[PDB]
Design a protein around this ligand. Structure first.
Ligand SMILES: *C(=O)[C@@H](NC(=O)Cc1ccccc1)[C@@H]1N[C@@H](C(=O)O)C(C)(C)S1
Length: 640
């Protein structure tokens, strides 16, 4: 019995050393190379475990149902079920047999070929044939392609088959003249540090007919991932990259020759898009004739992914940002379909996945405007657009009378002398300010006074009915919106700032589109949705229908009133309700404060579309409002 317990520890450590990928430590727990003992030496056990388990990408060996007893004076038998992960799938239900040995005080494993796979005998080999799975496509709500896979002919020259003296110069000139490439660039590539005589130095990417090939040039067809919208959806869609040996160690079910999603939806839906590797893992005899099969799946290509995105709206939303720092979110607010998720500046995903120079990659990473950031998922202070939420809360809890006219003297205001030098500031000197006026001119003082009058308790009570702190059900990495840093403002100043969208508020554009959706659904919050087939989910009674019917007519006046901050959008001649905002930020360099321009706009007649556009670190006279004319026209015509 005391010996049977030591054997269950030996089988445990032997399996553990195999599981931990240390095939040498497991080899030293075996007996000597002899009959009725170990079949091979230790160096041959290492090389057999390394060759076979390495070829099958064997990872995560775990056993169960261990049964160890006694067979003779020095012989102990052991059995167990086992399972392991391979590049083909899960290899479960493995009945392992063996015998232990107690020669001195230690117990060793009489190693046999049946301890690599159950039915191996003598000089049996292992064979693995695999078929790569085609990565699925990504498409928009109307079927247009967003990310597809295909073949790409790649021109390239062989330095050895190019020439010696003069003939190499002649072949370079013929390759240059027959492929439209400068002669100074062909020599710059074939002379790089990595190049060797008999290598394949790629040049151009043939996108049409293959022309006449001079001496030295040769086309090598390769697989590529194409992105039709390109940079206009690079943050959302992401890009794929060549699978590395580290990736295979983490998930053996990958193809060491395929691509893996690195960011965005390409990485988010990597499992669904990449498919499953097909093939067969068999045990052959000593000559290569197949005996027993261990795994066999057929190649199953990846699934396609259909998004709520509109390819036209996505490209228009991105183009309207003119390459400046910003982002635009367009939805159908009654269902939550995300029509566009643009971020700017961006990077070339085609260039990123189909070969990018190391200089260009550093440009993308050293760019201060940071093109790799998904700005529709970055938290910001919403600014003056947030007054709609504060107003709706003040109307619901009976704090704001729409017709009551506050008197506001001057452009500065503070509650009392305890505020020191801090004062809420108004841009327009309007003395008689009611709710409709405060939304048209965007008056901070009215909002600050009504927030302080409301109280912190009643303010948060209305705020907590929204999606602050919630994690949206979206395949986009994202932080939840927050009201402040802590559960209490503990400051009348901070309570006031939060009233008109400043303070410690952090709400990303997508979360803003979800929160502002209440004004298109009579106070019901409709959650955003990116997968076209998902079910619409909502959250009712977030604000009162009374507040919606009061505020939306005022938001029409933000566009229609001649002093409205969005009056430039009345040139469209379409039903629009809007609210602009400009948030000031002092979290970069103290040399100068930076401003973020915002625009919220939806159709108040049919509620077909909703838009939340942003400009980060805006230039002067530049706003989100002056750029939104084109996207609004498209959404108004195509989403009624
Ligand atoms: C809301 O965001 C308000 N903004 C400020 O009080 C800060 C600010 C920023 C730049 C210049 C002056 C003041 C108001 N809303 C914006 C807007 O709707 O664009 C105004 C510029 C009207 S102030």
């Amino acid at each position: 019995t005391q010996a049977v317990e030591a054997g269950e520890k030996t089988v445990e450590q032997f399996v553990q050393a195999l599981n931990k990928g240390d095939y040498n430590k497991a080899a030293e727990m075996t007996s000597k190379k002899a009959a009725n003992k170990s079949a091979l030496s230790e160096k041959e056990i290492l090389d057999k475990y390394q060759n076979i388990y390495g070829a099958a990408d064997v990872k995560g060996l775990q056993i169960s149902n261990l049964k160890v007893d006694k067979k003779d004076d020095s012989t102990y038998s052991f059995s167990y079920k086992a399972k392991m992960n391979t590049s083909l799938g899960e290899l479960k239900d493995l009945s392992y047999k063996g015998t232990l040995d107690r020669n001195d005080g230690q117990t060793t494993i009489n190693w046999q070929p049946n301890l690599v796979f159950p039915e191996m005998e003598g000089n049996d080999k292992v064979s693995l044939t695999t078929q790569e799975a085609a990565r699925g496509n990504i498409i928009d709500r109307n079927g247009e392609p967003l990310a597809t896979t295909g073949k790409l002919k790649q021109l390239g020259v062989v330095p050895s088959k190019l020439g010696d003296g003069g003939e190499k110069t002649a072949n370079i000139k013929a390759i240059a003249s027959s492929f439209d490439l400068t002669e100074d660039a062909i020599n710059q590539a074939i002379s790089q540090s990595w190049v060797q005589p008999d290598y394949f130095v790629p040049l151009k990417i043939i996108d049409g007919a293959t022309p006449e090939l001079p001496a030295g040039a040769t086309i090598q067809e390769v697989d590529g991932r194409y992105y039709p919208l390109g940079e206009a959806a690079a943050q959302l869609i992401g890009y794929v990259g060549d699978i590395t040996a580290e990736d295979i160690d983490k998930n053996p079910e990958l193809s060491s020759n395929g691509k893996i999603g690195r960011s965005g939806l390409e990485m988010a839906f990597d499992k669904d898009l990449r498919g499953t590797t097909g093939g067969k893992l068999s045990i052959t005899d000593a000559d290569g004739v197949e005996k027993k099969v261990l795994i066999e799946h057929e190649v199953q290509n990846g699934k396609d992914i259909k998004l709520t995105i509109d390819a036209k709206a996505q490209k228009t939303a991105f183009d309207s940002l003119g390459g400046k720092a910003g982002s635009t979110v367009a939805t159908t607010p009654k269902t939550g379909d995300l029509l566009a998720l643009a971020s700017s500046p961006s990077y070339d995903p085609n260039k990123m996945t189909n070969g990018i120079s190391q200089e260009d990659y550093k440009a993308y990473e050293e760019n201060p405007e940071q093109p790799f950031i998904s700005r529709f998922a970055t938290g910001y202070a919403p600014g003056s657009t947030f007054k709609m939420i504060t107003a709706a809360i003040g109307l619901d809890n009976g704090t704001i009378d729409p017709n009551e006219v506050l008197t506001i003297n001057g452009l500065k205001w503070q509650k009392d002398s305890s505020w020191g030098s801090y004062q809420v500031t108004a841009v327009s000197d309007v003395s008689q300010v009611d709710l409709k006026t405060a939304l048209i001119y965007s008056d901070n003082i009215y909002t600050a006074q009504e927030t302080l009058k409301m109280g912190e308790k009643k303010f948060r009570t209305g705020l907590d009915k929204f999606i602050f702190g919630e994690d949206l059900d979206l395949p986009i990495s994202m932080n939840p919106a927050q009201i402040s840093n802590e559960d209490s403002f503990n400051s009348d100043i901070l309570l006031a700032d939060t009233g008109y969208g400043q303070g410690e508020l952090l709400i990303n554009p997508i979360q803003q589109a979800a929160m502002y959706s209440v004004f298109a659904n009579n106070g019901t919050l409709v959650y955003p949705k990116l997968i076209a087939d998902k079910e619409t989910k909502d959250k009712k009674n977030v604000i009162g229908e009374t507040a919606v019917q009061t505020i939306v007519p005022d938001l029409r006046e933000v566009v229609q009133d001649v002093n409205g901050t969005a009056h430039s959008l009345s040139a469209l001649g379409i039903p629009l309700a809007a609210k602009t905002g400009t948030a000031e930020i002092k979290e970069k360099q103290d040399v100068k404060g930076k401003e973020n321009s915002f625009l919220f706009a939806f159709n108040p007649d049919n509620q077909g579309y909703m838009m939340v556009s942003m400009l980060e670190n805006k230039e002067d006279d530049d706003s989100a409002t002056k750029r939104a004319s084109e996207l609004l026209q498209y959404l108004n015509q195509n989403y009624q």
